[PDB]
Design a protein around this ligand. Structure first.
Ligand SMILES: O=C(O)[C@@H](CO)OP(=O)(O)O
Ligand SMILES: [Mg+2]
Ligand SMILES: [Mg+2]
Ligand SMILES: [Mg+2]
Lengths: 439, 435
């Protein structure tokens, strides 16, 4: 099976900004993939190509990226007649057209849609589900399929919501149940309880949501957020069954070698900005005070010494996830493994730009004993690729939003479909999320 | 082409509540539909088990599809292209006047999925199959004006603002693509202005993707929208629509525009005529092109009087008035209460009945605005429905949250597919079905 037609268009993401959609046609039909887009994007991410025409979409058009697909990538790839099942060859071909380390000739947002749609087409060519094709090409361990713990960002801050809260994501992780369906039900019940409690304490507007569907109360401290979530877990009836995770996204508030926990205040007092050591101490206290099982981007994207020190302190007690640190990039992951800076990778296909490189990132992580959490971006779409990716890679953990806003539920609903299809051939990762690939 | 397998499951809607999804398999493949969620409505069946989803499970509706509808329909071997026969069969199976045995949520999923299978059986897009079975005027397809709910009040905001929905309608351009782009730009400008004026928190979004700052008066809301249109660079090109949802503040035959204040002075509540005056003033000061539920759901005389006043200058839309209900619709047409209907397919429960309600409206010279629900999904059926029915109007949210954008994105795909065989309804949205 090879591409007969490849056509790109722009569509609107969940924030109302344009992004790239690719239609990849073979003998088996038309396969569509849509590229997501971040807000708190790491400086080391592959290039997201935007038009910069201030008169259209506030400079956020993707007409140039779409044209790169239609006029450069499409005719070259179609001429090549590459078997879509050979994902590595598809991706090698796409990388050859760009020839830059950060995909800055064509744009990662031109390349990725083609890479992902090829994988969908390949699944169809073999008459297998996408998650099985991914398990094949990633060399996942053979046995039961592992369904991921849904890490649900139920309270949004940082760059994803207006208000004072600096830390980006406060997540629940329903690890203390035996099935994915139960975990999603519990997440939805805790979330609804949280919405009710948030409106009662902070007013109706606090129950409106951030970019990823979490409630967005205007609060200044992590303690206030965590206390709210603990109350929701308790009032929903699931005390002791629900872990908490954070994405600090600390690069967003790293200034003058320090960390501003009031960074959205134009008049933030710089005498109150924390050093690396001061911020590390705050985490150690929170990890003791709350059932926090995972912290992501606790220090800035190149603040290696701070990660290394913190890992020495608490790496055996919690999952420590690289996101902006690692940017789903094997070269950065190598450095992080050598330095002992983290013990898990946040896997974002659009940080690196091809499925093959994303899978290499995952396998490099697994080889080092790391966990992998497959992730959405804050600018998401109706695309559901990451659901199948999370299952195929046997990650045992996915981050794809609060159980609100359908760019989030679309992924969670797809896992429900996968769970039903597999029946007893699947197990839910549950408490084993961190080492799920080995199960 | 007939059903070889029909299977339902629950999935989660855009508010995190369960809803029904149907997989309908034929020789052409698997076709999926998902049902949305919000005495005159078809009834959605919920489980009421307070220990699961706070009583909002749809296990019973799902079981009705799997154990009752699927085997009966599969046995009957009905050609899916014959939507009317499919829906007649489904209605016969239930037999109740409001679909309360099997549930409207069980019935609609099968009805919509069958339509998708039927399009595939004929090798045509869903919007074309809908055009065919609805007997839409032959000629160019009409792409709808997106009525985009950018700013919320009423029960959706903590301020005094009594009116429920403020929408933009980018009518002053020649293409759907340009309309949607302008809508996105105006929305982003509105968000920015809202955060500046009311604080960063006021930028966080409601169920349909709009913002809900603490606003005091309709004038304050409309001035904010006008400022966003102007700052975005599209002065004169963008209409405004309102959903007043006036039943929410109708008390003792009067209209309390400060209904969220428990000490609202009843001597300041507006009479029907005073509220009509207010609307007339707003229509003269702002480019308001449509008002939904300007008067309460059974305050018929008020609608009739208001229609005689301004029915020739603006669209007047029934929602609570009409409830996608054939008899309420008849009454409204006979009384001359309004000139447009909100079409909510899940309020009536089959595609055939939805199309009948649209055609009854068109026959009376009414407009039809195809509508989302508050609880939406990644399903895009209503995009193809708005195009196939030649409605010229769709209400499917702000340009934020993908249960809203998925519909608008589908229209982009339809637009590209059609090229010169499509026209944008633009300023002609009211009578688009006759364009
Ligand atoms: O930092 C993050 O983990 C992401 C995903 O939630 O947000 P964004 O896509 O804006 O980077
Ligand atoms: Mg980020
Ligand atoms: Mg992150
Ligand atoms: Mg209404």
């Amino acid at each position: 099976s090879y591409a007969t037609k490849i056509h790109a268009r722009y569509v609107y993401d969940s924030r109302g900004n344009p992004t790239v959609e690719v239609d990849f046609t073979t003998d088996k039909g038309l396969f569509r993939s849509i590229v997501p887009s971040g807000a708190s994007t790491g400086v080391h991410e592959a290039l997201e190509l935007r038009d910069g025409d201030k008169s259209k979409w506030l400079g956020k058009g993707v007409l140039k990226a779409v044209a790169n697909v239609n006029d450069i990538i499409a005719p070259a790839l179609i001429k090549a007649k590459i078997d879509v099942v050979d994902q590595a060859k598809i991706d090698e071909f796409l990388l050859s057209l760009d020839g830059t380390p950060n995909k800055s000739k064509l744009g990662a947002n031109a390349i990725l849609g083609v890479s992902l749609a090829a994988a969908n087409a390949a699944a169809a060519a073999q008459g297998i589900p996408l998650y099985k094709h991914i398990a094949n090409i990633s060399n996942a361990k053979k046995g039961k399929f592992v369904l991921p713990v849904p890490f649900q960002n139920v309270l949004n801050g940082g760059s994803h919501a207006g208000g004072a809260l600096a830390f980006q994501e406060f997540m629940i992780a329903p690890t203390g149940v035996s099935t994915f369906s139960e975990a999603l039900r519990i997440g939805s019940e805790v979330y609804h309880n949280l919405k009710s409690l948030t409106k009662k304490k902070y007013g109706q507007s606090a129950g409106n949501v951030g970019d990823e569907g979490g409630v967005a109360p205007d609060i200044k401290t992590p303690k206030e957020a965590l206390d709210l979530i603990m109350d929701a877990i308790d009032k929903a009836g699931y005390k002791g069954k629900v872990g908490i995770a954070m994405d600090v996204a600390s690069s967003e508030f790293y200034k003058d070698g320090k960390y501003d926990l009031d960074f959205k205040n134009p008049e933030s007092d710089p005498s109150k900005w924390l050093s690396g050591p001061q911020l590390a101490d705050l985490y150690e206290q929170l990890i003791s005070e709350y059932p926090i099982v995972s912290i992501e981007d606790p220090f800035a994207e190149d603040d290696w010494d701070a990660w290394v020190h913190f890992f020495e302190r608490v790496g055996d007690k919690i999952q420590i996830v690289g996101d902006d640190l690692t940017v789903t990039n094997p070269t950065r992951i190598k450095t992080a493994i050598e330095k002992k800076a983290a013990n898990a990778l946040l896997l974002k296909v659009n940080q690196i730009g091809t499925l093959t490189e994303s899978i290499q990132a995952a396998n490099d992580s697994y080889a080092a004993g790391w966990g992998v959490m497959v992730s959405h971006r804050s600018g998401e779409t109706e695309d559901t690729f990451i659901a199948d990716l999370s299952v195929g890679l046997r990650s045992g953990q996915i981050k794809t939003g609060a159980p609100a806003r359908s760019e989030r539920l679309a992924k969670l609903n797809q896992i429900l479909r996968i769970e039903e299809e597999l029946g007893s051939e699947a197990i839910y990762a549950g408490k084993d999320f961190q080492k799920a690939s080995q199960l």
